[PDB]
Amino acid sequence: HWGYGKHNGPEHWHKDFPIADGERQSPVDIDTKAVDQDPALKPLALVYGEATSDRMVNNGHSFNVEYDDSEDKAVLKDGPLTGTYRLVQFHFHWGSSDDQGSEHTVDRKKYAAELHLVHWNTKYGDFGTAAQQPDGLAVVGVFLKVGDANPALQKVLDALDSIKTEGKSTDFPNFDPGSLLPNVLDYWTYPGSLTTPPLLESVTWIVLKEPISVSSQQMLKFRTLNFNAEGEPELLMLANWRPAQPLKDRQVRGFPK
Ligand SMILES: [Zn+2]
């Protein structure tokens, strides 16, 4: 089973998921001086006022905050997109020290962590159907820059002791995903993939230019999670980031430039 260890990690995923070596894989490094403007791009609309969080779950690879996506309660529109994309869950990637852990990088700079807000196009009826299509998924990436402690983030981290091990979940109502956004929604966008197997090439990436904050102490809490289930030897979730992949024949575009 794939993971982030020496034998089963990113370098090896290509063996069981050869699309790892595909034409539109994520993440990438964003070489900012190679970014194009495009007047067709719009401001991002993150319509999250009605969001209804459900629960938090350790899936053996990260933890997800899942949302009720049965109707348009927390949706993503505009930016580079056409149509409505519903928020299904968010999750994070991090590393084993503060100097690394983001999946996307900006002129080779790694941040301590990265938030992924995963959305699917209503045209496809549900997440699994949408994940098979080039315009099916849209993921908003937000960097966590080590600095000040973040109170909104701490509400998530306060629940982590309840989901230490794979398979555990905890109820998690009333969490406003907009509370994990920077004040400015400037972004980069490119066509890419999910960053975990099966690495499907169905994602319009929207990476926000401005990070949100996290403290060094807060980063410790991520790394208390376990990849293993309860009763198995403790495999700490010290790092769960895929490194930057080659951009190949794609163009990153930026809004407002
Ligand atoms: Zn992710």
Author numbering: 4 to 260
Quote the study on this structure.
A well-studied carbonic anhydrase II was selected for rational design as it has efficient CO2 hydration activity and could be heterologously expressed in Escherichia coli. Thus, to better understand the key factors controlling halophilicity in enzymes and to develop a halotolerant biocatalyst for hypersaline conditions, we undertook rational enzyme design by selecting just one of several mechanisms present in halophilic enzymes: increasing the incidence of acidic residues on the enzyme surface. Herein, we describe for the first time the successful redesign of a mesohalophile enzyme to an extremely halotolerant orthologue, that is, one that is active at 3 M NaCl and above, by altering 18 surface residues. In contrast to suggestions that large differences in accessible solvent area, non-polar surface area or absence of large hydrophobic amino acids are the important features that allow halophilic enzymes to function optimally in high-salt environments, we have found that increasing the number and distribution of surface acidic groups alone is sufficient to impart this characteristic.
The conversion from mesohalophile to extreme halotolerant enzyme is conducted in stages to assess the effects of substitutions on overall protein stability and degree of halotolerance. Crystal structures of WT and engineered enzymes were obtained to confirm the presence of changed residues, that active site residue positioning was unaffected and also to compare the overall structural similarity of the designed proteins with that of WT. The structures of the four engineered enzymes superposed almost perfectly with the WT enzyme (maximum root mean square deviation (RMSD)=0.42 Å for M4) with no significant differences apparent in their secondary structures. Some of the orientations of other surface residues of M1–M4 were also altered compared with the WT, although none, with the exception of N62D, were in the vicinity of the active site. Up to 18 amino acid substitutions were made to the enzyme surface of bCAII, but this did not significantly alter the secondary structure, catalytic activity or stability of the designed enzymes, compared with WT, in the presence of added salts.
